Design a protein around this ligand. Sequence first.
Ligand SMILES: Nc1ncnc2c1ncn2[C@@H]1O[C@H](COP(=O)(O)OP(=O)(O)OP(=O)(O)O)[C@@H](O)[C@H]1O
Ligand SMILES: Nc1ncnc2c1ncn2[C@@H]1O[C@H](COP(=O)(O)OP(=O)(O)OP(=O)(O)O)[C@@H](O)[C@H]1O
Ligand SMILES: Cc1cn([C@H]2C[C@H](O)[C@@H](COP(=O)(O)O)O2)c(=O)[nH]c1=O
Ligand SMILES: Cc1cn([C@H]2C[C@H](O)[C@@H](COP(=O)(O)O)O2)c(=O)[nH]c1=O
Lengths: 208, 208
Amino acid sequence: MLIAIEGVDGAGKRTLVEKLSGAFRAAGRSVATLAFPRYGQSVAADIAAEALHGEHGDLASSVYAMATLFALDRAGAVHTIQGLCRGYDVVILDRYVASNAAYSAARLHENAAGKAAAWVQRIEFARLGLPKPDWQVLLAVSAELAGERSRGRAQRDPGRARDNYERDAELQQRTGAVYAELAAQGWGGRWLVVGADVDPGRLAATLA
Amino acid sequence: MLIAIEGVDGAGKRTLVEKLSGAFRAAGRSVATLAFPRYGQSVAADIAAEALHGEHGDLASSVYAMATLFALDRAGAVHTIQGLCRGYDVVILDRYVASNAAYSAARLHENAAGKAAAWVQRIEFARLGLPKPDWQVLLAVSAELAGERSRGRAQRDPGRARDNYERDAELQQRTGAVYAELAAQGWGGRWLVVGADVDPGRLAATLA
Ligand SMILES: Nc1ncnc2c1ncn2[C@@H]1O[C@H](COP(=O)(O)OP(=O)(O)OP(=O)(O)O)[C@@H](O)[C@H]1O
Ligand SMILES: Nc1ncnc2c1ncn2[C@@H]1O[C@H](COP(=O)(O)OP(=O)(O)OP(=O)(O)O)[C@@H](O)[C@H]1O
Ligand SMILES: Cc1cn([C@H]2C[C@H](O)[C@@H](COP(=O)(O)O)O2)c(=O)[nH]c1=O
Ligand SMILES: Cc1cn([C@H]2C[C@H](O)[C@@H](COP(=O)(O)O)O2)c(=O)[nH]c1=O
């Protein structure tokens, strides 16, 4: 089973992955986790991050260029994902294809039924062959709280200055809204919308 | 030995590669040829071409985004290039790293000593590890003649409509000028500037 944890930056995704992993292992399931972007491992991922921090000229100014880099990173992980699904009972991804749909649509002020979301569908799932997840869990949080976390993280870690998207409060707001639409639409597969207070044990039971 | 044939679109590069290959083989050297972009083989290359034909939203509007796609295509060919150099006496490339420097600088109205050219140097040769060619042959041609060839090709082949750059006559002009500067500068290695009338036998002798 392939599960993707989605949400805006600062939503608490990494923490949910950790808690969920423990819940699954408690239930006797083998668990593997993979996070996107695959920084260090993927040049596309690194260039994208660098672009979001002021490098590489006009690269970040293009919505589709950024989406393409994140898609190329995932395309290079297809073998990894297939291998993990063959080796473990549960594979949990911290961010996946839906991240591209949410942020891309938001940057263009489009909704989940828009052009960008459809483009991501055609490119990543169909053309690049990324498998559709069995579950996509939206960790919904208020834009204000998520933002406060992204800022706090930058104040405590010098190698963690916020990226261009995180410095755009309205973009974060719109991204959260597109995520809610994607979930209601069942974009790319079935979704579950949860909060930071969700019970790992029950969530794992629902997913397994 | 690694030789790259450079020049604007419609300059006559493919023809020179063919004639040069024959000249080298006549001299008893084994020859291999590789062309960039690696259409079909590289997703980055295909997406880039598609973007230059009106697809993928605002992707082509970013100079660095386009340069990145062409660089990622080449990065995926490093193994191929090293293998060819180990297996043949001469390896001839139809377009290489300099193509990115020339077109990128031109789109930004910069010269060979500019930011874009330097960025290409840092990314492709240093960061991505692409080997610097032993020779870079600039097939210089008048912008008018090159353009007439690109147009004529589109009139005869339906699957060959001109790309966005080819539809920009001034851009082609500026690209030719940046190429001349790159050659005079010895950018990325030594260059040779030749015309369509160059003698394959002598050119091959010079390169070998
Ligand atoms: N970014 C990553 N996050 C988590 N696990 C990863 C990541 N990249 C690779 N792995 C895991 O580490 C082990 C793999 O890597 P290696 O990188 O050694 O694989 P390969 O030798 O390229 O094998 P394969 O094609 O199966 O991935 C695999 O079992 C894979 O599931
Ligand atoms: N786009 C290309 N143009 C010309 N020759 C190519 C191209 N792609 C691969 N080749 C050549 O075709 C043969 C290779 O390909 P294959 O694609 O079968 O290689 P591999 O099995 O991936 O081997 P290697 O790592 O050596 O490339 C090689 O000898 C290589 O030099
Ligand atoms: C994985 C992914 C991240 N992003 C965004 C989220 C951030 O603003 C940034 C990097 O992600 P990260 O904060 O999870 O490391 O890029 C996308 O736009 N598309 C994607 O596919
Ligand atoms: C290989 C390469 C081509 N190009 C340009 C030349 C064209 O306008 C187009 C495709 O190249 P092509 O006409 O040789 O198939 O992109 C670059 O800008 N950078 C590159 O690295």
